[PDB]
Symmetry: D2
């Protein structure tokens, strides 16, 4: 008999449907950072990777598998064919178009739409019950696009949104105050990147509102120029890109944190991009970041942050601009 | 008063006295895989990064800092100047050229010896009591080089060695038997390279020797071709490099594994590059992998594996190859 | 409008079942050590507790719940009624009388069988697909009883068995060798109790056979008296009982280690109580520890350990001692 | 000659002085819950236990040691003599009388002062540079006593304080709001006991002030009776004590949480017992919980909370009750 049969007496065969499966789509730097972060937090019992680039895909799989001894995720698989993603609880999309010399925000989004029209139906075919976490940029528009193509109810389509923006805000807040980011509390909401909104009113340490100690916080009337902290959040991605080519590590950690809440049904509150029609005067099918309760069903609830009229008008303006673009798309 | 002063009453102005500081030298694929692995395993209270490409360096540091919210490593610093590395307990050298598709690690040696002549004096200046963990290829030769340039005693100069080769081996064993790598035991010793030695006599599950069950194990007349598993270990780096252009994740996890044992004083046994003059008839200052006890003072002890005379010969043959290259180097 | 209404907007009313639910029956010393160990290892999304002592049950539940902020298991419940236990993946049984100073574990059979006749049918009614993990003593006999009462197939009824004895053995081996127990390999099989069998032939560090180095190992005229190491393993519970009254922490951790393999489908090998009819000359339905591959379907496979004729005779003796007790049961 | 020497070739004899040693004094329910929580969080490379009852102490030590295989804390030691405590970074004092069912923690003062008169000088003799973490009740008063007796600067004498009371408060908040405690922020300050102070004005989810949404929050006329939540917090220990005899798991986890900030130098904010003379109108050497930044040097800073004058008067009353007792004590 074979060595294996001499060593091992089998009791039964027949596998079970995978219980805690995560899929990552796109094995570029962002996707791989999400993968390694997920593996190191033991969030999945199986991890599938999918991309069109067959060699890199396989290479990344192999390199992760070679580290199996040091992990507690016993099945890692990959393939260009989406059958490898079947029965995933959570599917993380990082795939997208790359920008060139110019050219047009509309053009850029349209090329992602085209890429999504292939990816999204493939994902829903094999994991009809999954939650979709959209990480690709521009994330708020692309969460809309994934929602539209999947036909998934809004609770199961989530955009990473201002999750990383807020964690960046808390880091920079921590640097200034000499306090770990965990104990610095602060929310950046609305549209990811340029037009995000720093909610100065919720900024606190140990429940002490920075705005109470310092009423002019964040305005042009404060000597400490905390507005600069929000600018840095907006600008920090551009600087990292300029310096190393791209962002990856912070997005990976940020995403694993969302995955943790989802996979473990924690019901923690995260700033993620969600369909906000009917909130803040918004009447269009648009996704923006507000604080959401994350769990086994995706977004079960959201928190209604009291915004000033200025803050509401910023979110409304963002919604208008996003809808302006989405209205012109074809799928 | 500044907002910070209104919020926070200072009791003491502390010092910058890190207790468990790790420095990673070189922030390419391998360096950053080592860094994220370390960060996600809470092995350090301070992470220092060093490189000669300053924009890359700053960008990688910033990207890690933006994830501080999701970490428990409160200080992450970097710089081209080695003063940021001061008082490191562990310094991990990942700097230098890497093998391209189809290229031997031994072909990297002149390029990387030059960069070790720059790096090593600068690390010893600012962390004279650190342990050196050498990752750059050819890792065995460069462990000797680091040992020689540093003037450190041999216990504090450790090459990542065959910790990875043995991990890969156990993964492949695992795939063949349907058993998790944790419960598959087997050792690859010698060069981290083409002349590595698979110790067939030591391979086991639950302490039952595979060689005893299957006397033709790893031989030519092996119908099951277990020699192909070791071949696959040998070829694994090249296969991953052919597919994705480099290896990173598996070595990142191997290095973290080694770091864990050192920083937590675990006294686990790892196959790491060490000075083996006096064993197996070797009488030159050759470094290569044999199982070592790893802890707070680096390698405290060597395990003496019972090798066959063929295995012992392989190891000697490998030793003489490495000494052939090292003898011509000057410092 | 309630505070909750004003603060939170609800999308999803329904609540899907818990995906990774564990139940611990018996909230005495062992039950709670299992509980805390499992909670700190993030192995469950829901933890259910059962006991016949209502006060103590509720008190223990509340004490854990108060620590929720520091855990990642969002639902902790209890009741004397087994409806709280429904849809459990894993049900760990720790209820029953414990041996006092000097008392054999086997002296507990009549008392703990009678308790099992009430507990097991209730567990099965509410979690028909669960894996049963038996900890109550005598654990080997009670696993047999749990198998017979439940009507479950043998793969899904596991006794904690010699996972603990083996951990103790490796600790003691470690203390003697100056090596972490992780790197010391030695197996103790058969009864979790006085007739346990140390497999000397399999003891190793880095795959090097201690027995081969030391032919007297485990013999009476061994100058180093290694039989004393196995003696200490046999005696360990008795010593701990006489010092603090009972054992809890170590079994807590051993149980969590088993639950980890089961809940995460790791396919690691553990010596656990299982039906070994048909090996080592055993013709009856004896349960005792042999190495088993442990995963999502419980015990999927047994490792056939190659015992010396003395080792096998001791193991056969162990099976005879156990069947002698089993043989006269009523349920 | 020995098996050990045939197996292992030694390089170094020198060793000793762990980097991250923690001592727990008192191995009753609280001490051992701290111990297991600390071990499972890998906060220490050595753990020392002390108690006056020698058999109990050895039994608890041995039980933990038997689980060594499952932990990454390679040295666990105990003794009645404080020499085993030498060189601790952190010493946790749990030894003392515990309150009976109908009993104030403040009724324990004389008994536990007596105990600290013996314990503290012995602790400081062997670890003059440790941080003291006081858990024994009444924790605030005994933190003052520890500070007085030891001669340590106030930054290095820390009471577990309201870290637990706040966790309970957040758990109960989470239950009412359908949200994980991590995302529910509310602070209970002052005495770890009956005069604790709920900071209604700082309570929030995602930076949204609950008091502004619901102005009667915390008042008598509140239709939702939120004041009942703080009543539950005050009564929680007595309720748990009535049900199971004592509290252990939540304080263990809370203490582990404090230990993690200290040992890893995180500079997170925690409500812990410290000397609050000079603030909130308090002019005496009272120790009470306020939010403090915890790190490598203990309490490096404290956060001044902008209490409402109603909230401030309650804290002042807590200060007055505690001073009434403090001022009578004999050294
Ligand atoms: N021991 C092992 O098993 C493995 C070793 N390696 C080796 O690790 C090394 C690095 O590989 P990668 O990170 O993929 O290469 P990489 O090109 O991505 O990064 C190398 C880094 O070293 C830096 N560097 C060069 N000279 C330097 C100096 N004087 N001081 C500081 N930094 C300097 C470069 O600027 C670059 O950032 C290679 O030699 C590779 O073969 C890679 C995988 C596994
Ligand atoms: N397999 C192993 O290695 C180990 C086994 N043990 C065994 O574990 C068992 C438990 O020991 P401890 O927790 O120390 O005892 P304990 O007396 O502290 O707790 C046992 C609990 O089981 C409960 N119980 C009794 N009848 C019950 C029923 N019909 N349904 C539900 N709960 C019931 C009791 O109310 C009690 O709370 C004993 O048989 C002991 O000998 C203990 C240590 C290690
Ligand atoms: N701060 C907090 O939130 C909490 C505080 N506690 C308090 O912690 C203390 C311990 O409670 P348990 O552990 O439940 O009590 P316990 O009775 O289980 O343990 C007390 C231990 O202290 C030891 N001890 C007594 N005098 C000693 C001395 N002179 N030297 C060394 N050891 C000595 C005893 O031998 C005993 O093992 C009590 O004061 C209790 O009220 C308890 C829960 C929470
Ligand atoms: N035939 C199958 C399908 O294959 C592609 O799907 C892939 C995307 O193309 C990838 O993204 C690409 O975008 C760049 C634009 O510059 C390209 O150059 C480059 N090759 C890629 O990186 C993305 N990461 C993964 C995704 N699975 C097409 O989109 C799709 O229409 C077509 O039906
Ligand atoms: O979206 C991004 O790439 C980012 O913010 O890092
Ligand atoms: O050294 C290498 O490149 C490897 O083995 O991954
Ligand atoms: O069975 C027991 O009590 C033990 O071994 O701890
Ligand atoms: O102090 C106590 O006993 C408590 O609150 O658990």
């Amino acid at each position: 008999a074979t060595l294996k049969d001499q060593l091992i007496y089998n009791l039964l065969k027949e596998e079970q449907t995978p219980q805690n499966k995560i899929t990552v789509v796109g094995v570029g730097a962002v996707g791989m950072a999400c993968a390694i972060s997920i593996l190191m937090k033991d969030l999945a019992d199986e991890l599938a990777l999918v991309d069109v680039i067959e060699d890199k895909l396989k290479g990344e799989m192999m390199d992760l598998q070679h580290g199996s001894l040091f992990l507690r995720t016993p099945k890692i698989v990959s393939g260009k064919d989406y059958n490898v993603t079947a029965n995933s609880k959570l599917v993380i999309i990082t795939a997208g178009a790359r920008q060139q010399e110019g050219e047009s925000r509309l053009n850029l989004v349209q090329r992602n739409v085209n890429i999504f029209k292939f990816i999204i139906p493939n994902v829903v075919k094999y994991s009809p019950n999954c939650k979709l976490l959209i990480v690709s940029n521009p994330v708020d528009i692309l969460t809309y696009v994934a929602w539209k193509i999947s036909g998934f109810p809004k609770n199961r389509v989530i955009g990473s949104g201002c999750n990383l923006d807020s964690a960046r805000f808390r880091y920079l807040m921590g640097e200034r105050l000499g306090v770990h980011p965990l104990s610095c509390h602060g929310w950046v909401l609305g549209e990811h990147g340029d037009s995000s909104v720093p909610v100065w009113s919720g900024m606190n340490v140990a429940g002490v509102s920075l705005k109470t100690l310092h009423p002019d916080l964040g305005t042009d009337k404060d000597k400490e120029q905390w507005k600069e902290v929000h600018k840095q959040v907006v600008e920090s991605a551009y600087e990292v890109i300029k310096l190393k080519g791209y962002t990856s590590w912070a997005i990976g950690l940020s995403v694993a944190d969302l995955a943790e809440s989802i996979m473990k049904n924690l019901r923690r509150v995260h700033p993620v991009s969600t369909m906000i029609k009917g909130l803040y005067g918004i009447k269009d099918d648009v996704f923006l970041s507000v604080p959401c309760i994350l769990g086994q069903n995706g977004i079960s609830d959201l928190v209604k942050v009291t915004l000033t009229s200025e803050e509401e008008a910023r979110l409304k303006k963002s919604a208008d601009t996003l809808w302006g673009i989405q209205k012109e798309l074809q799928f």
